[PDB]
Amino acid sequence: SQAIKANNLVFLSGVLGLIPETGKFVSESVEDQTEQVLKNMGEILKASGADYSSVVKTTIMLADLADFKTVNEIYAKYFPAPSPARSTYQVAALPLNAKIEIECIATL
Amino acid sequence: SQAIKANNLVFLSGVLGLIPETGKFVSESVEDQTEQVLKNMGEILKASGADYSSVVKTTIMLADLADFKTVNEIYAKYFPAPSPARSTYQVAALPLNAKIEIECIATL
Amino acid sequence: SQAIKANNLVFLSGVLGLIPETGKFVSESVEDQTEQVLKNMGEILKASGADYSSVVKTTIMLADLADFKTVNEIYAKYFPAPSPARSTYQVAALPLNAKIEIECIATL
């Protein structure tokens, strides 16, 4: 599932920068994918009765930490200060060769 | 500890594909290790008063994402749809050169 | 934020081995950084009304799993048995080229 509610909380799967409907990446660029991830996350959270403001913890998995400034810039637009708790790191690879995956936990 | 209950929830340590008793890998193959991980997880969850059906979130750490189809096939047997929330990624290395590590969170 | 309380629980961001005040690494060595991470974590937890003994789950992200014995030794001093649930793995890279990042979840 994309999200599981256990009841004070909701647990999101790691989100990729895919057009939900089609399962293809929005583009090859981390800049588009990051924003698509965040958009996708907002949809999943809202459907779940959560929202960006109820997120308590995120984890950002990157293909390349050199992308961090662009990623942070975009992320900060959806999660302005004070923002969720967060961890960030560069992994060896992501599913479907994605540039970025973000998972999160939110309150209901 | 292998698991900590905080009380609506239980938090599992990342599980490796070891024969619990002996601490040696079941084999070198991701196919055996994945299944051993899942078996080990079921034991830990049950001992804890949880079970596969109460798992809400998993994280699969892989040595090689090329293993994903085999891993998914096995995983899907223990976690049929609708399955827990889940993240998957390839790490640089795992403890003891394991092929796969899975952690999870479950309800009580 | 460094930590978010949702209320039975507190979620910590991944902690690096920086002198909090200055934002520079305590040193280049994993041995100093690991200990600084743990110290930093204790401060964040206490400020939050938690403490090392209320931590339920940690995740250790390493630059090099060859560092595991030194890391484990230090960690075990702050988290003696029975210790939190825990996952450990080697990532491709960490923010600011850190040697180690640890995140955690604790009870209040």
Residue numbers in the entry:
A (entry chain A), B (entry chain A), C (entry chain A): 80 to 187
What does the primary publication say about this deposited structure?
The current crystal structure was produced by the construct starting from S68 (named AtRidA-S68), and it diffracted to a resolution of 2.0 Å. In the final model, residues S80-L187, as well as 85 water molecules are resolved. In the β-sheet, the strands are antiparallel except for the outermost strand β4, which is parallel to β3. An extended loop L91-E110 is located between β2 and α1. AtRidA-S68 crystal structure is disordered in the first 12 residues, which accounts for the missing strand. There is a central cavity in the barrel-like trimeric structure, whose height is ~31 Å. The buried surface between the neighboring monomers is 1306.2 Å2.
By converting the reactive enamine/imines to harmless 2-oxoacids, RidA preempts damage to BCAT3 and ensures that the isoleucine biosynthesis can proceed. In this study, we determined the crystal structures of apo-AtRidA and its complex with pyruvate, and analyzed its structural basis for ligand recognition. The RidA domain retains the basic overall fold, and also preserves the homotrimeric structure with the characteristic interfacial clefts.
